[PDB]
Every structure is written in structure tokens, then in C-alpha cells.
Symmetry: C2
Subunit: 132 residues, 2 copies
């Protein structure tokens, strides 16, 4: 009555005030179970770099209305996974390029996946994480 | 010291309160000259369906900051034209599909081009037009 859908490294542009922007390989673990969706971001080299998201079906309706999400809750993790794969596969010089960004705030972070083409940067998903 | 860059029909989903949604072939004429950008939307069958946008270099900096536009003013019309072409070429069943939408308000309209994929609707450009 629970399953891991994804457990892989992803290149993430980490942004934190008072620090230089860096690109880090961060591990994402996506779990579903009884319905909830849980995502953990960790670092294979920093035991205390830990960020978690937990979304219930209810919370999802909110997300769904704000970001033009067109799928149901059951299919949402697949949307996230397809975006993360585009981030993993992006190469220098690519256009369009998908990039993952994690902005660190006090007690909360914002994870987004954006598409950068020759004309515009477009957000595809934006999600709130908390430490731990 | 002036030039037409585009003069072609585009399929547009026209939305107006108190009317049913319709899909119309509307003619777009894009002009540049001395710098300004002018766009006219018309209908080959309704002499009084007329909407115009005029953008100066100054107005563009505003647009540029709000919608993540990554090009300079000189290259902006090409961005619009590339989006309009995707709308023209979209076929039933396509995914992703680009669609053009014109929402009619009192004395102003909003033109947008959106991308619809299996997961999300994404706006690529949003522009204000006025009658005439």
C-alpha cells in the first residue's frame, strides 16, 4: 500500500540569499501511498540537506487550479517525473532547455522546473518544500 | 522606413461574455517602423471586427519584465510570428497543441497564445489590444 516511483539524481540550480548560485546533483525520491504523494530531495554528500513535500488529494485541487494542471492526482507524479527527466537530459547549448531550480528560504523552499527557449522562460511546475 | 512582417490568417478562439465560444480565422498584420511594433487583427468577413496593438521600445521593457521575454525589441516580432505559425499548423489531436485566444472586454481585448500538453496549459505570450 505504498510505492517508490522515482529515486534518481537530478541537476538542480540551488539559490539562496547570501550565497553564490550553484548547480548540485540532488537525489529525488518520489513515493505514493494511502492517497498521498511524498517527494524527498537530498544530497549524497550533505546529510543535513533535506527537503520534503507531502501532498494529499485535497491539497492537489489547490495546486491543480493555480498552475493549469490538466491531469488527475493519480497521473500527477508522472508529470513531475517527465519534467525531471528533461532536466537530467538537458545539455549545454540545448534549446529548449529544461532546468530545475530550488530557492532556499527560511523554513521553506520553492522548487520549480522551467523551460528556456530562444524567446522566453516558462514555468512548468512550482512546488513548496520544507526542511526535513 | 516601415515594413510588413506578416499578413496571414490565424485560427483564433474568440471569447466574449454573453456569447458562445467560437473559432474564427482572423487576419493578422504585423508592421514595424520608425521604433514601433504594430499588430492588427481583422476579419475577412466582418468589416467592424478590428483590434490593434502598438508597442514602443519603452512599452516593451514593461512587457519584457512581466512575461519572461528573453529577446530584444528587434527580435520580438519573430517570437510572435513563430508562435502564430504553431497555432496555424496545429491539428486536431496534436499534443502539444498551440492555440490562440482572443478575449473580448469593453474597449480592450487580451490576446494570448497557449501551449496545451498532456499535463498543463502554458501561456507563451499575452498582449493587450484595443478596438480599431
Amino acid at each position: 500500500t505504498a510505492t517508490t516511483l522515482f529515486w534518481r539524481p537530478v541537476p538542480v540550480h540551488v539559490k539562496q540569499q547570501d550565497r553564490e548560485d550553484v548547480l548540485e546533483e540532488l537525489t529525488f525520491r518520489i513515493l505514493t501511498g494511502v492517497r498521498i504523494l511524498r517527494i524527498h530531495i537530498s544530497s549524497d554528500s550533505d546529510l543535513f540537506f533535506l527537503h520534503t513535500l507531502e501532498v494529499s488529494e485535497e491539497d492537489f485541487q489547490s495546486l491543480k487550479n493555480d498552475q493549469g494542471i490538466l491531469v488527475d492526482f493519480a497521473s500527477f507524479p508522472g508529470c513531475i517525473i517527465s519534467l525531471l527527466e528533461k532536466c537530467i537530459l538537458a545539455q549545454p547549448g540545448d534549446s529548449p532547455r529544461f532546468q530545475a531550480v530550488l530557492t532556499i528560504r527560511g523554513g521553506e523552499s520553492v522548487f520549480k522546473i522551467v523551460e528556456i527557449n530562444d524567446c522566453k522562460q516558462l514555468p512548468h511546475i512550482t512546488l513548496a518544500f520544507r526542511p526535513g
